[PDB]
């Protein structure tokens, strides 16, 4: 949908203008859930290999947690930018074509006659 | 205690005893012994309690709910103003359930005391019941389980129209 918009650099992960957006908080509910998905992987890895699930290979478990939070942090930053761009383009379009998105005056319920449906 | 205007109660008119037999009324004896052995000790226990409740006197209040814009003053879709109009109506609708109960307490309280003259001496309470029932039926009947202000308004508008069409002919 947004592939060919103006100024769209090719295969740019985090364009420069993304830096005007607030970063993901480090303890973001979304980043934290990545940390848990990493921890489970380390546990599943020990299970599949027949090792003590929690005691064994803590260096691996630490690096699974770090890898997923690290990647999730930068992936989250990109989705924020993509979502920011979507609104940016959506609203600037509303401005450039006002005749297509007319403001409407909605009558109050004093003036509306909603049909009544008895429940007998 | 209770407010005697919310709960009207004719004054009692007990005829003064006229004992023309030589025998002793066994009711009036166990009533004395009951007062000395049952009533008197209990009243001390209660007077003891109310002297504690006087030392720790605490207060609580009836909550005031100012009036918010009606549903009729709400633009369609504005859930911010519909929500408050809807909450108010639900409060109102609930106070009307309790008004009906009060009017029912009176009618029940009159039926008992008039006894064999209820068909005659319970007219005023039966008239308020018959009137406050017609109002209730004109506000809340047939709304359904998902009753709300907007349905209450729709029911009223459909009725104000069916009556305007009465005089539009007559
Ligand atoms: C599954 C069913 C639950 C459905 C509802 C989803 C939300 C429940 C998960 C909560 C996890 C969490 O929020 O931890 C992240 C927390 C940051 O939370 P915060 O951004 O400050 O405010 C959000 C308030 N809900 O930061 C933390 O404190 C988490 C760090 C400790 C994690 C262990």
Instruction: List all residues 6 or more positions away from B40 whose beta carbon is below 8 Å from its beta carbon.
Output: none
CA B40, B43, B46: angle at the middle one, nearest 5?
A: 155
Q: What is each CA distance from A113 to A108, B147, B156, in whole angstroms?
A: 10, 17, 10
Method: cryo-EM
Alpha-carbon gap, residue B30 to B37, rounded angstroms: 10
Residue B68 forms beta bridges with which residues? none
Alpha-carbon gap, residue B141 to B151, rounded angstroms: 11
- Supply φ then ψ for residue B83, to 5 degrees: -65, -45
DSSP assignment string, A11-73: T-SS-GGGGGSPPPPTT-HHHHHHHHHHHHHHHHHHHHHTS-TTTS-HHHHHHHHHHHHHHHH
Within 13 A of B166's CA, how many CA atoms are on the CB side? Answer: 6
Secondary structure element (H or E) that encloses residue B150, with its range: helix B149-167
Task: Give yes or no for B145 touching A (CB within 8 A).
Answer: yes
The set of long-range contacts for B64-69, using a CB threshold of 8 Å and a minimum separation of 24, is: B65/B91
Instruction: List all residues 6 or more positions away from B71 whose beta carbon is below 8 Å from its beta carbon.
Output: A109, B82, B85, B86, B89, B149, B150, B152, B153
Protein residue whose Cα sits closest to atom 15 of ligand 1: A29
Alpha-carbon gap, residue B38 to B35, rounded angstroms: 6
- Is B157 in Cβ contact with A116 (below 8 Å)? yes
- From B161, which residue of chain A is nearest by alpha-carbon distance? A113
Q: For residue A108, give the nearest of B160, B149, B112, B78 by alpha carbon.
A: B78
What separation, in Å, do the N-terminal and C-terminal C-alpha atoms of chain A show?
51
Ligand 1 cavity residues, CB under 6 Å: A 27, 29, 32
């Amino acid at each position: 949908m947004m592939n060919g918009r103006p100024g769209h650099e090719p295969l740019k992960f985090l364009p420069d203008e993304a830096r005007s957006l607030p970063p993901p908080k480090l303890n973001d509910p979304r980043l934290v859930y990545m940390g848990l998905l990493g921890y489970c992987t380390g546990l599943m890895d020990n299970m599949l290999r027949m090792r003590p699930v929690m005691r064994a290979g803590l260096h691996r478990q630490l690096l699974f947690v770090t890898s997923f939070v690290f990647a999730g942090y930068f992936y989250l930053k990109r989705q924020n930018y993509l979502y920011a761009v979507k609104d940016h383009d959506m609203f600037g379009y509303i401005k450039l074509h006002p005749e297509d998105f007319p403001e409407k005056e909605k009558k109050t319920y004093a003036e509306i006659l909603e049909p009544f449906h008895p429940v007998r | 205690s209770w407010d005697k205007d919310v709960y009207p109660e004719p004054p009692s008119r007990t005829p003064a005893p006229s004992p023309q037999t030589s025998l002793p009324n066994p009711i009036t004896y166990l009533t004395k012994a009951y007062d000395l052995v049952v009533d008197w000790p209990v009243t001390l226990v209660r007077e003891f309690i109310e002297r504690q409740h006087a030392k720790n006197r605490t207060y609580y209040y009836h909550r005031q709910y100012r009036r918010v814009p009606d549903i009729t003053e709400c633009k369609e879709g504005d859930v911010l103003c519909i929500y408050e109009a809807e909450m108010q109506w639900r409060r109102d609708f609930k106070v009307d359930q309790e008004i009906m109960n009060i009017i029912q307490e009176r009618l029940k309280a009159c039926q008992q005391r008039e006894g064999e003259n209820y068909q005659q001496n319970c007219a005023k309470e039966l008239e308020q019941f018959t009137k406050v029932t017609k109002a209730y039926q004109d506000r809340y009947l047939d709304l359904g389980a998902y009753y709300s202000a907007r349905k209450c308004l729709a029911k009223q508008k459909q009725r104000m129209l069916e009556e305007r069409k009465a005089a539009r002919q007559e």
